[PDB]
Amino acid sequence: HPFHXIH
Amino acid sequence: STGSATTTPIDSLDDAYITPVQIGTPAQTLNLDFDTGSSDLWVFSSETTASEVXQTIYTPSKSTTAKLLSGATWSISYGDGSSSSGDVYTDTVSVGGLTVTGQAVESAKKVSSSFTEDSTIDGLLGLAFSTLNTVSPTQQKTFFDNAKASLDSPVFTADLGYHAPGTYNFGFIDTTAYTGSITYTAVSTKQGFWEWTSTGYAVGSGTFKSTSIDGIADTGTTLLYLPATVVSAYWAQVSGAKSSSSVGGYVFPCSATLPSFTFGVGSARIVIPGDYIDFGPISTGSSSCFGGIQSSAGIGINIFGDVALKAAFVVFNGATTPTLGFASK
């Protein structure tokens, strides 16, 4: 349940 | 001054780590995801659209200190597509004893569906460089930019654990938390990220290949995203491995002893144990597992997430000319 943080 | 806090995985897959923060007077304790790949302090609050709220909420009206940054507003989007916005208050924030006054706390009026389903994460603590803060019209310093002037040393350290608690230190370097020495390496702030360049990589007991790899340390990123050629070289040693389009990446039998991975740091080498990379079954009961190293080709930016960070003791040195330290443990 991967997390992927600005764009 | 110094602060120390414990950091806990939100699950048995180290998908992420939460860290208790005390906001307002009296203390309102929230579990926050410390995200170095961004620079915003925002939290679920009384202002958040109720139906979007499932998390400990921040009530500024219950805080005597809390002020309202008038005419200010923030909106932010992340890699996973998630997003949130709202308005801003100034309030006291303390992390592991370290207390900062007038820290801008962003109140969420709305939060994308992903967060709402995320019960264990009350908000995030941005630890990137201030230039990436989304508040308008005037940007707001991060918790770290604010504490610097009262810290013993302008450094914070992330000692994440593999399926176990870790720690965030602020202002000092625990010489008992790591082994050997710390090798420091340049940091480019051009993107406002903790962006450095690795000297290369190796797979298991194969040969170290000197090849520049420009990426960023992002604790708020679960996996290790590297260029394609690198990644494939790794799985090529893993027999049952294959790229899966439906799952979204590299899978491999849960019974395969994975090779370790090595990324250069100066003339130094950090070795990611194979076990770390075996992230976890694609679903409970499956005999197929999901790799921790995946291609960065989609993100368009190399990212050393928790799979790499958690295998080392990292030093984010916030001095005038920043550097990133790395040491084994």
JSON list of C-alpha atoms in Angstrom, two decimals, chain A, chain B residues 15 77-80 220 222:
[
{"chain": "A", "resi": 1, "resn": "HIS", "atom": "CA", "xyz": [0.00, 0.00, 0.00]},
{"chain": "A", "resi": 2, "resn": "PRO", "atom": "CA", "xyz": [2.67, 2.37, -1.20]},
{"chain": "A", "resi": 3, "resn": "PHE", "atom": "CA", "xyz": [2.81, 6.06, -0.31]},
{"chain": "A", "resi": 4, "resn": "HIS", "atom": "CA", "xyz": [4.13, 8.76, -2.63]},
{"chain": "A", "resi": 5, "resn": "UNK", "atom": "CA", "xyz": [4.42, 12.29, -1.28]},
{"chain": "A", "resi": 6, "resn": "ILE", "atom": "CA", "xyz": [4.92, 17.58, -4.03]},
{"chain": "A", "resi": 7, "resn": "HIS", "atom": "CA", "xyz": [3.84, 18.16, -7.62]},
{"chain": "B", "resi": 15, "resn": "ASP", "atom": "CA", "xyz": [3.99, 1.60, 4.04]},
{"chain": "B", "resi": 77, "resn": "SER", "atom": "CA", "xyz": [-0.79, 17.97, -4.77]},
{"chain": "B", "resi": 78, "resn": "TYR", "atom": "CA", "xyz": [1.36, 14.85, -4.38]},
{"chain": "B", "resi": 79, "resn": "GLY", "atom": "CA", "xyz": [2.85, 12.12, -6.57]},
{"chain": "B", "resi": 80, "resn": "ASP", "atom": "CA", "xyz": [0.13, 9.59, -5.71]},
{"chain": "B", "resi": 220, "resn": "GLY", "atom": "CA", "xyz": [7.26, 10.29, 2.64]},
{"chain": "B", "resi": 222, "resn": "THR", "atom": "CA", "xyz": [7.50, 4.07, 0.48]}
]
